[PDB]
């Protein structure tokens, strides 16, 4: 749970793939829709994420993205330590599952406002990050990182 | 120079369009490559930005994106006040031009490491945001927003 730790997570809807990165200490997320999970898509997403937040370590979502030399090349480029995503703490499995279920719930709630799934997913990212549970995940991530810079 | 104010900026390279959002107070940026600058592209980009940072006001980059009902709909959805980008302070034109020149310089410096321009642009976003000029823009934006929350 340090300021620079993120977890990748890949979930499926409408025959498409939603790739999510989770900042583990705050639960803030960034996500995108891609037609399938490849090392090249995953690598590009990580390059995007690391330009926007100070990404120190990423726990990859599966062994294909851990092995992928393209993902390792992007983590080299961006200065990220690529790690496995083994739930040594069994709580991690459950936390990710129920986030996927929350996001899919939200996507359902908005899905009728968007023609394309990618709009719905970005509406869901906005609702997740602004939800007060008291602070939101977007507030918690800035607090944590600012505390670290100081 | 409030924590929530952003400026849109659109520049061209390689026959393609790079859309950039600038957090005015810090100089932090987010950017993407699109084939052309339509209201639907600009609206989706603002929906992405506002799910990731607390975007209160956007100064649009031109009068077509100010007029566009699709951009107004995204700003309504995401709770953003859409404003014009008139440089009442003439310092503004100059700052934006100098940023586009800096990004294009960076993109040149990386361009041969990437097959696709979108990779190069995200490398340039990462270098711009991490550059110490002393704090980086990525550090300044987190400090500013954390100060505002507190």
């Amino acid at each position: 749970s340090s300021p620079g730790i993120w977890q990748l997570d890949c979930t499926h809807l409408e025959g498409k793939v939603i790739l999510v990165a989770v900042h583990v200490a705050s639960g803030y997320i960034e996500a995108e829709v891609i037609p399938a999970e490849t090392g090249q898509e995953t690598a590009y997403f990580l390059l995007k994420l690391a330009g926007r937040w100070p990404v120190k370590t990423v726990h990859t979502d599966n062994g294909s993205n851990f092995t992928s030399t393209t993902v390792k090349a992007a983590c080299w480029w961006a200065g990220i330590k690529q790690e496995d995503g083994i739930p040594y703490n069994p709580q991690s499995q459950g936390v990710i599952e129920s986030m996927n279920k929350e996001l899919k719930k939200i996507i359902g709630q908005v899905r009728d406002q968007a023609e394309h799934l990618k709009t719905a997913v970005q509406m869901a990212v906005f609702i997740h990050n602004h939800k007060r549970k008291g602070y939101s995940a977007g507030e918690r991530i800035v607090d944590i990182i600012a505390t670290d810079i100081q | 120079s409030s924590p929530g104010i952003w400026q849109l900026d659109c520049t061209h390279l390689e026959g393609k369009v790079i859309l950039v959002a600038v957090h005015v107070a810090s100089g932090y940026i987010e950017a993407e490559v699109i084939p052309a600058e339509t209201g639907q592209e600009t609206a989706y980009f603002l929906l992405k930005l506002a799910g990731r940072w607390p975007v209160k006001t956007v100064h649009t980059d031109n009068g077509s994106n100010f007029t566009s009902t699709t951009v107004k709909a995204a700003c309504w959805w995401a709770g953003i006040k859409q404003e014009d980008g008139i440089p009442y302070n003439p310092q503004s034109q100059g700052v934006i031009e100098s940023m586009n020149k800096e990004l294009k310089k960076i993109i040149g410096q990386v361009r041969d490491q990437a097959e696709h321009l979108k990779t190069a642009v995200q490398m340039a976003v990462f270098i711009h945001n991490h550059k110490r000029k002393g704090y980086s823009a990525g550090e300044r934006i987190v400090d500013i927003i954390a100060t505002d929350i507190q």
Binding site: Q40, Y44, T70, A73, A74, W77 | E115, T119, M123
Partner: peptide
């Protein structure tokens, strides 16, 4: 291709 986004 000897590029970060296309290692071939």
């Amino acid at each position: 291709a000897l590029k970060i986004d296309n290692l071939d």
